């Protein structure tokens, strides 16, 4: 259990801190786990999802589908995959909204910084 | 697009001055266009640029004055530390630490002695 005096087990406080979290904080909550491949590749279990990454839906009814993240919708706590959409009745397609904890990262998108993140978590990077 | 601050700080006092008129002339014209087109988001950028210039002109005219006052009594009130009205008038460390001549000889001759109880 919590041993620190600055942690709060309070449920009402957690749920406030989630929904009222600023854009910067949602970035890290919106982490997705690396694929078993990419994990032993990079020596790292999970990373905050970013836009042009590549991803496989491992949960839900889009289970098995893959694509490129078209946008991180931080406001909505949802990530959108280009290639995963609803065809509507009038035929106009519309994005589905996915949660990064139900995705898996199959290809990263690397930066000077995106690399340094992997290095700051203590893992190899091919 | 839009003006960058670190790039303004290298421009001359009169260079930035003419940038500002150029931006104003720019912004003045855009407002004519805005009432024909049914949106003009480019205008937000040029009015932010003006703001960004005026800051820089101000920043430099201030650090000019701040240094040619630097190090002396009586510099203008808006270059003095803001702090708090009370902190402002709190005794300086010098007239706090001040100690009576008789008091000083006593601190010297009988300071609090470090000691301990065992043997």
């Amino acid at each position: 259990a919590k041993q620190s005096l600055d942690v709060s087990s309070d449920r009402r406080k957690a749920r406030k801190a989630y929904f009222t979290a600023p854009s910067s904080q949602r970035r890290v909550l919106l982490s997705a786990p690396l694929s078993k491949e990419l994990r032993a590749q990079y020596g790292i279990k999970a990373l905050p999802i970013r836009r042009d990454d590549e991803v496989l839906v491992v949960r839900g009814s889009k289970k098995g589908q893959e694509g490129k993240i078209s946008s991180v919708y931080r406001l909505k706590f949802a990530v959108q995959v280009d290639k995963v959409t609803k065809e509507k009745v009038n035929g106009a397609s519309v994005p589905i909204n996915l949660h990064p904890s139900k995705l898996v990262i199959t290809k990263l998108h690397l930066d000077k910084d995106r690399k340094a993140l992997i290095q700051r978590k203590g893992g190899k990077l091919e | 697009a839009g003006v960058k601050a670190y790039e303004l700080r290298t421009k001359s006092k009169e260079q930035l001055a003419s940038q500002l008129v150029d931006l104003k002339k720019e912004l003045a014209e855009l407002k004519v266009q805005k009432l024909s087109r049914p949106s003009l988001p480019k205008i937000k950028t040029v009015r932010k640029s003006i703001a960004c210039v005026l800051t820089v002109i101000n920043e430099q005219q201030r650090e000019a004055v701040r240094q040619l006052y630097k190090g002396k009594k009586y510099q203008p009130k808006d270059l003095r530390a803001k702090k708090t009205r009370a902190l402002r008038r709190a005794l300086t460390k010098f007239e706090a630490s001040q100690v009576t001549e008789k008091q000083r000889k006593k601190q010297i001759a009988f300071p609090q002695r470090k000691y301990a109880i065992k043997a």
């Binding site: - | 006593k106 001759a109 009988f110 300071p111 609090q112 002695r113 470090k114 000691y115 301990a116 109880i117 065992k118 043997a119």
Partner: protein
């Protein structure tokens, strides 16, 4: 408003007493804060022991005089028979009291002997720099019982 056979109570709640109720909900809180207080101080205070040497003293009136109890400070006389001045004894952790007088030799000697044993059982580090680390005893009251 008077009936049966009952003691006559005197319960003074005719003012606005609910305004002035004090429930000590902070008992546990303030005990911790007092323990932390003492801890933080024992650290700031170097090997010095949190408390000062206190004299033997005979407790007043007819009811308590049979018992002897710790006083405030040591009476410039008793300080002087133990061979140190007031000013220095204060820096040494001995409490001095200019107001207390000695009408009684037996107590007078007890406090001089108390001062003697204390002087022997302490070490006073040099003014210089060295501070030869000595491991604080926290009491004086416990080391020098009355």
């Amino acid at each position: 408003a008077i009936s049966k056979n009952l003691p006559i109570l005197k319960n003074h709640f005719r003012k606005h007493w609910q305004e002035r109720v004090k429930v000590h909900f902070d008992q546990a809180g303030k005990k911790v804060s007092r323990r932390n207080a003492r801890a933080t101080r024992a650290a700031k205070i170097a090997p010095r022991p949190l408390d000062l040497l206190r004299p033997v003293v005979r407790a007043p009136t007819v009811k308590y005089n049979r018992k002897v109890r710790a006083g405030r400070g040591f009476t410039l006389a008793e300080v002087k028979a133990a061979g140190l001045t007031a000013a220095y004894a204060r820096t040494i952790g001995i409490a001095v009291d200019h107001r207390r007088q000695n009408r009684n030799q037996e107590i007078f000697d007890a406090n001089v002997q108390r001062l003697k044993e204390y002087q022997s059982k302490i070490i006073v580090f040099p003014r210089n720099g060295k501070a030869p680390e000595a491991e604080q005893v926290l009491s004086a009251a416990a080391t020098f019982p009355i």
